[PDB]
Amino acid sequence: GLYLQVGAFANPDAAELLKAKLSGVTAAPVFISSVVRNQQILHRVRLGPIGSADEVSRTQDSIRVANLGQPTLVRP
């Protein structure tokens, strides 16, 4: 499956907020993957697995319509 990342935040409330908003625009699973980067925690907001490239493109479109960020492909 294919995955998108929509934002990455130092503040977990901001990541959780984006996750909640994304649930209103896609049916794909939305999740936070938190990692240590540059001596801090980075909370990455991701969605997937998406079953096709065409669904990825339409999901990117929906995220932009909702003004929720710049969705980019990622490989966990």
Residue numbers in the entry: 266 to 341
Quote the passages of the study that discuss this structure, keeping the authors' original sentences:
However, it is known that the sporulation-related repeat (SPOR) domains (Pfam 05036), ubiquitous in prokaryotes, play a central role in directing proteins to the septum by recognition of the unique septal PG (rather than recognition by other division proteins), which is enriched in denuded glycans, the PG devoid of peptide stems.
The β1 strand forms the central part of the fold with the adjacent β3 arranged in an antiparallel manner, and β4 and β2 contacting β1 and β3, respectively. The first repeat (residues 264–303) comprises β1, α1, and β2, while the second repeat (residues 304–342) comprises β3, α2, and β4. In addition to the hydrogen-bonding network between the β-strands, hydrophobic interactions play an essential role in linking the two repeats in a single compact structure. (i) There is no discernable conformational change in the backbone of the SPOR domain upon ligand binding (rmsd of 0.27 Å for Cα superimposition of SPOR domain alone and in complex with 1). Therefore, our results do not support the existence of “open” and “closed” conformations as a general mechanism in SPOR domain recognition, as previously proposed. Changes only concern side chains of residues R302 and R309, which offer two distinct conformations with direct involvement in ligand recognition and F274 that slightly changes its orientation upon ligand binding.
